[PDB]
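pipeline/complex-builder :: batch 7 item 3
reading input block
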Amino acid sequence: VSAYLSRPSPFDLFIRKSPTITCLVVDLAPSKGTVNLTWSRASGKPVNHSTRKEEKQRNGTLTVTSTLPVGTRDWIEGETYQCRVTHPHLPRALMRSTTKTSGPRAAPEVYAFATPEWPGSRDKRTLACLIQNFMPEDISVQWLHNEVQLPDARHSTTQPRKTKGSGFFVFSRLEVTRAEWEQKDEFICRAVHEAASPSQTVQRAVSV
Amino acid sequence: VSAYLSRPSPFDLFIRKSPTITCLVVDLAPSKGTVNLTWSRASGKPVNHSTRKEEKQRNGTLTVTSTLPVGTRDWIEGETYQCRVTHPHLPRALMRSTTKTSGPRAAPEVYAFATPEWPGSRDKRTLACLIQNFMPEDISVQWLHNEVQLPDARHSTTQPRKTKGSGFFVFSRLEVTRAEWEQKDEFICRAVHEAASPSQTVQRAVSV
């Protein structure tokens, strides 16, 4: 029985302009009672209506999440939100809180590229992107075929990792068909991040 | 209070030829009693002497690990080892087990490269490597300046991530000085993995 609270994704915060935070509760072994999640603002101000999702996987996880729409300005100004998790059997209630990260800011550096695909085949052509030197750690990464964005499910992005002083880096891998591999020059890796002024967005086409 | 048991690193198993497994126990809040770790072989056979390490970080973690030297052949043949963790306050003892992963095998594909370093500076030149299409997920990655291996602490490697059917991929980043950046053609990314016959090793120099 664990719980996690995540900050808004930069994409939802700066592009979409409709930030949300999510409280995720994982129950390795389900005993039946209801799992409650309560939201509150440290400032005492009112919180909006949240969305609850319950999903079972007979593997060993009754996943439960609650997504709370957050004010854009309030979040940027530092409001702190709290998720109070109430599971039937446990003594004390779980409590998680989140706020914007403070500290210095640094823009992301983006580098997209293709992996050598030397004939004689059994395959998977791959495009990949390295995004680095950014801080804080929150960032949204997305692939585009020119001006149109591809579904998220198509790429795999690693978790932000610290480095030597610089800040953070993330790596994204995108497997593509032979067809789109012929127009790889048209694929673009885009990063959305707070420190990337103007418009918190930085992108680069696959170098060839 | 959590526990983790890891399999041997491919490097220790195939190059060094002296495999070890490690039981790591993390105690977020220390109450003082002793933390015991007991090793056993599912086959009942004798286990060697293990090495115990205790380290404190007033942050909130009394880390404790026990490393057990493992037989090369026994491990390759499928022996299963168990770590029985005994902490003072908890009711039942924690138990973790590990064995070689079964299933299909696939060699790693290695691609090393340098990130564009366009003048006008405040910096960090970087070399990076993408290793993919391998399975099982255990792999050792290392950087070398020609024939000599660099200290591990110098690079950062992501955790193996699944993909679409293919298998796994891992990304490694290596920040270098302006000096070594002049001889980047000499840096090599090497992967040690079971399916990479001959000698379970595959490497590639930084493409330029």
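note: The radius of gyration of chain B is 20 Å.
queue -> next item
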